[PDB]
Paper text:
In Xenopus eggs, NPM2 replaces sperm protamines with core histones upon fertilization, thereby promoting nucleosome assembly on sperm DNA Laskey et al., 1978; Philpott et al., 1991; Ohsumi and Katagiri, 1991. NPM2 can also extract out somatic linker histones from chromatin Dimitrov and Wolffe, 1996; Ramos et al., 2005; Bañuelos et al., 2007. The acidic tracts in the C-terminal tail of NPM2 binds H2A-H2B, histone octamers, and the linker histone H5 Platonova et al., 2011; Ramos et al., 2010; Taneva et al., 2009, while poly-glutamylation and hyperphosphorylation of NPM2 promote its substrate sequestration ; Lorton et al., 2023. Our cryo-EM structure strongly suggests that the NPM2 binds to H1.8 as a homo-pentamer.
Residue numbers in the entry:
A (entry chain B), B (entry chain A), C (entry chain E), D (entry chain D), E (entry chain C): 16 to 125
């Protein structure tokens, strides 16, 4: 369980949890823990979602909704991602920081 | 675990998590994760429930209650649905978006 | 897991989760999920508790405390009741609706 | 799982979860569930902790922090005590009620 | 499960969960439970994080964000640390108290 974090904002509205092609050989995940508003986040309900594809029709996984006045930070426990997995802001301007741990296995290279 | 979402509102007060009859042959579920108020949701306590039937007397499963000022979004973890399962708004006007993952198994069609 | 709900208020200050004597033969439970204030609930901290008996001295299990302005609804996860189990309002006027699922096993009556 | 509750306040700043010496022969616990402010609690952040001893240097286990305006009640799930275990108010005046279930095993005395 | 707590503030912006080299021989952890603002904490969103190192590029694990007016205290359940693990305040002035239990095994020294 290496440890992972990123942000989504108007400057980084989209992101991606992707593991290196060499590293992707193993089973890799990203077990998310928390999502917290950034310093430049607007006072509105910013929504973090995932972008993927199903049956050719565009789709996304809503992850969280945050607002500094009510819910600036929430616990994203029970949410895991199998890389590659795109990140997007369904709503808001960010920065919405997403935390977690990149679960990655490594072979014996000794 | 394909990934799933819908909304309930005055325009869609009722919905249903149903898997296709061909797909229903396998064990299908919908493990819910979160429920979040929509952009057009009223500032009141909107309640999301499920509609089913027991012993011929009408019944529903209350899923969540949300309000933009207090609890616009909640985590619907530990809630799973076996399709078909109707959705309804016990109270409110919506849109109340319900998230989750449609757990579906597929046979080898190669 | 049949599904269950009730309310406690000045009209129903006390209630009971009881399974029928014929049904009680099996192991029956009521896994609670959520507790939500009713439409007629006062703007105060209404407390839901259970009534039982220990060593002959009167006792109760506090389940929840709710207020429309702060915590109108809470998740009563991890709380399970073995029938019969009385319900009472430690404080408040209700209606405080208690949700859950009545876990009940049935024999083969074919 | 017998069921347990107590309060800590200026009148009862300290308490203890202790099982009777005769009962202590078995493995006894107190799985805590919730902590809620009392009727006489002040509008400040009252902190509930445990008192014990380690390596001869005084120590305590902070359990919770509550305030009527923000967090009058919280879920103390995942917290278990092995009796005897002293209770104290790290901060506040109480009453802070602590809930739970005293898990106790009994031999066959028939 | 010995029991553990510390604080991070302008006076202690950095800390560390480290087990003694003699004690480190066994598998040691620190299962965190809660994080609560101190008496001298400013009315802003103080962020607690961990400091470590990955692939030579500096990094940290954000643990929590707290504010007395909204979220003075939160439950840090599901978070565990393998010593040594540095603590830092990503934002804020503290004191932000971090609770938990130091899980430590000891050999038979009789």
């Amino acid at each position: 369980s290496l440890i992972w974090g990123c942000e989504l904002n108007e400057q980084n509205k989209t992101f991606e949890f992707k593991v290196e092609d060499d590293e992707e050989k193993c089973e890799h995940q990203l077990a998310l823990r928390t999502v917290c508003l950034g310093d430049k986040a607007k006072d509105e309900f910013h929504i973090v979602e995932i972008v993927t594809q199903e049956e050719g029709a565009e789709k996304s996984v809503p992850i969280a909704t945050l607002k500094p006045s009510i819910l600036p930070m929430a616990t994203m426990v029970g949410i895991e991602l199998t890389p590659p997995v795109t990140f997007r802001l369904k709503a808001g301007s960010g920065p919405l920081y997403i935390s977690g741990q990149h679960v990655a296995m490594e072979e014996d290279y000794s």
